[PDB]
């Protein structure tokens, strides 16, 4: 037990199509993540934008995991991952007032392996405007959880959260209403 | 459901009493099983399972990696903590306490960082011990926390203490 | 400025 906990290096590399993620976490929250494609560091806390972190470190470090993962595949006689069942919950950030604006929060927990599709829906139609997701955030049991957001001004005739994961027989939908 | 092989490396730091107690733990993980780790309190790579035994022996053999990993407690954990003291550890968000009925009274604490809180329910200046149910600490993910403390039921007061607050906020509900 | 923790390579594969 400690007063504060930080993961100065959450390194993730899986075989489902070389999928890589490099993040830094402090007290369970995401400080920044390195986009391995654009080779850019994206800070999630505005006060942390003053610092600088070379995106090249993430690329070279992920390449080490790539070597390591392929080594453990031969050693463990190709022991694959176990698809856990996700736990999804939908809630709002602020108290629901039909005029004021609020953000809907769809928290998906127990995500292993780190492969998931989180899609917001509104009366059977897919919503793409005003959505944003967080990186795979690590857990003590070495699983992950992901949070997707949807900004909206709530109203009486106004959502569902579609989660697609291999630990599910069918796509799971959690409904939200005012 | 195709076969997926996952590998993780967590370079984690543990802090207690500020900078007085600092512990460095780096975990190398295959799927969900940590195979080899380095604890700053043991000072050497030790395997957790047999899969990490070749790596722990090879890394302990390279005295250059050992020398630089023992120093990582200061160069990583203690160094980056001085950056947290000027940024994240200074972040203070005052909570927003609103009361709304849902027989049931719900006091909603919505936007506060850090996570330390203590919410009490009062019924005519006498604290209500039983009959109160509170949700767990809800992590919003955007460096804010929320909690919902609910109460089944003259004047009812929601007592909320927080480190960012000098004196607790006492929102009240009646009728 | 944030100092990171690297992962060491496994031997022989």
């Amino acid at each position, epitope marked *: 037990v400690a007063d504060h906990v930080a993961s100065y290096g959450v390194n993730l590399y899986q075989s489902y199509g070389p999928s890589g993620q490099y993040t830094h976490e402090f007290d369970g929250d995401e400080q920044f993540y390195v986009d391995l494609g654009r080779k850019e560091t994206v800070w999630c806390l505005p006060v942390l934008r003053q610092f600088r972190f070379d995106p090249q470190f993430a690329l070279t470090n992920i*390449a080490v995991l790539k070597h390591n993962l392929n080594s453990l595949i031969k050693r463990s006689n190709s022991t694959a991952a176990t698809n856990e069942v996700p736990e999804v919950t939908v809630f709002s950030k602020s108290p629901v007032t039909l005029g004021q604006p609020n953000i809907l929060i769809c928290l998906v927990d127990n995500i292993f392996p780190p492969v998931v599709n989180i899609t917001w829906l509104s009366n059977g139609h897919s919503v793409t405007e005003g959505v944003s997701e967080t990186s795979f955030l690590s857990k003590s049991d070495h699983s992950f959880f992901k949070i997707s957001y949807l900004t909206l001004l709530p109203s009486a005739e106004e959502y569902d959260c579609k989660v697609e994961h291999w630990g599910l027989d069918k796509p799971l939908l959690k409904h939200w209403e005012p | 459901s195709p076969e997926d092989f996952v590998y993780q490396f967590k370079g984690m730091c543990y802090f207690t009493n500020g900078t007085e107690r600092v512990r460095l733990v780096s975990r190398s993980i295959y799927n969900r099983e940590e195979i080899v780790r380095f604890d700053s309190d043991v000072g050497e790579f030790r395997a957790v399972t047999l899969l990490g035994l070749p790596a722990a022996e090879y890394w302990n053999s390279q005295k*250059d*990696i050992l020398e*630089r990993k023992r120093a990582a407690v200061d160069r990583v954990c203690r160094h980056n903590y001085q950056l947290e003291l000027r940024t994240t550890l200074q972040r203070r968000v005052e909570p927003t306490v609103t009361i709304s009925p849902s027989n049931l009274l719900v006091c909603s604490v919505t936007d506060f960082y850090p996570a330390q809180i203590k919410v009490r329910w009062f019924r005519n200046d006498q604290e209500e011990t039983a009959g109160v149910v509170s949700t767990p600490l809800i992590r919003n993910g955007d460096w804010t926390f929320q909690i919902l403390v609910m109460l089944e039921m003259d004047v009812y007061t929601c007592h909320v203490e927080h480190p960012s607050l000098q004196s607790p906020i006492t929102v009240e509900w009646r009728a | 400025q944030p100092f990171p923790q690297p992962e*060491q*390579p496994f*031997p022989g594969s």
Partner: T-cell receptor
Amino acid sequence: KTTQPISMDSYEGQEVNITCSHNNIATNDYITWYQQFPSQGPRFIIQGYKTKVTNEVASLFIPADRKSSTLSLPRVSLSDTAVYYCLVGGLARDMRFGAGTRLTVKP
Amino acid sequence: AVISQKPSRDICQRGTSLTIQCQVDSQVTMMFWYRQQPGQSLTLIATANQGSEATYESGFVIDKFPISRPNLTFSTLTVSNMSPEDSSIYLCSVALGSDTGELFFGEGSRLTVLE
């Protein structure tokens, strides 16, 4: 990043102290020294960090200010004639080479 | 730790292209390519990246120094359309982990380009 003497002279059996100037050194920066014989590549000799270290080929002295560092070779022999580089950085990517100090060992 | 460079020595004519190899006995994180002219300082060319594009230093372009790294233990540096300026000793350095202080250098590749 580092400033070191251009060249030095010494006789065999003498302690040689090459002093490296590394002002503007970061707290997490590490001190490294290399020895390159002619036609060959540089060879790592000693490594230090806010801590004077002593090894077999040599010893490294690190002042608390960390604004400077000094490599000490005891009982220098004819075979120690080489170019000595002073490298200061955090990671391996931060290791840039300079002009070095050309040390000649006379008999 | 132990590095083997194939082109220990070679003499090429102008306009030709030569490929240098850098093979390491052990698995290493970092792999660099250096260059040292007859009487000059050791200039860093680029950093070989596995599965990505090489990180070239200022002045060095991928068009003249194409670099590939198929595995962590093997890299290839090519000098295309050679000119007499290229005549140099091409070194490849190696770091086991990115947080090591010891760089292992190879024995080198002596190059002399002639008009």
